[model samples]
Target: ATTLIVARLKPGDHRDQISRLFAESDTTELPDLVGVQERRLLTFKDLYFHLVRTDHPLFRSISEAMDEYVTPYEGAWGSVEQASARQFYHWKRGLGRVQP
Candidate 1:
């Protein structure tokens, strides 16, 4: 299943700085794991949203890998998994079957 993850940007963090940080750290080098399809970063208000699609039965692998990559950005990576407002859903259609 395709999953959408939302991580809140810590206080004082902004999108541009995050982009630069990822570039400088080469964190954009995502793993070529089997069943992995696409990933994208989006920002809304003070939070960063990660959109990931994968058909792997072990989907948690991708999420764990992402956490590891962002571990260095302590201030920018919050305990979003423990957040109270987290939500999950699917599109009306399987857009994941379409384009990237």
Candidate 2:
């Protein structure tokens, strides 16, 4: 099993630009994250989910505009309430969310 370090894409960015950004950024390719196996980046609905398969927790260091290009979900994703959104009735949209 692996853990997904979720985040939201920055403004003025589109889903198609994810691969290019990932290649140019230092988000992955770190020696410390050796446990990382597969690298998956997908545009789930309006959110760009950077999913990585790792046996343990992960961290990273980003450079250039990439730091702002893809920020933490808690920082820039959804609203203050939606970021920590609480649901009442169960619902799912599109492909739904990816969780363990």
Candidate 3:
């Protein structure tokens, strides 16, 4: 399963926190979470999103761990509302074909 977290960073040193937590691959905290097939952080100004792909069981554990990780920054974390778009028609757009 894949989980995407979209949120806004509050005005402050939240960026530093992100750097410490996500940017570094050798992080020692929150070590219980495991089985991360892939992880990426997308950024645009103060808005950011975290994408994580993992197995079903691991996904659930990671989700919970993430909640705890961001709890301290509650005021800065802004949840993303409903998405206004989807990629259902991308295959017919003629842009190109997805390679395996």
TM-score per prediction, in order, is 0.43, 0.45, 0.43
- Best by lDDT, which number? 2
- Residue 74 of model 2, lDDT score: 68
Q: Please give the lDDT score at residue 51 for candidate 1.
A: 65
Give the alpha carbon lDDT tens digit for every residue of 1-100 in model 1: 5666656555554556555544443343343443456656786765667665664434554444444233322344445434323345434575653332
Identify the runs in model 2 with alpha carbons over 4 angstroms from their true place.
14-17, 24-33, 55-59, 63-65, 76-100
State in Å the error of residue 40, model 3. 1.0
What is the TM-score of candidate 1? 0.43
Q: Comparing candidate 2 with candidate 3, which one achieves the higher TM-score? A: 2
Top TM-score prediction, candidate number: 2
**Could you tell me which 10 consecutive residues in candidate 2 have the lowest summed lDDT?**
78-87
Question: What's the residue-level lDDT of 99 in candidate 2?
Answer: 42
Model 1: per-residue Cα lDDT at residue 6: 57
TM-score of candidate 2 relative to the true fold: 0.45
Q: Candidate 3 — what's its lDDT?
A: 0.50
Model 1 gets an lDDT of 0.50
Cα miss at 55, model 1 (Å)? 20
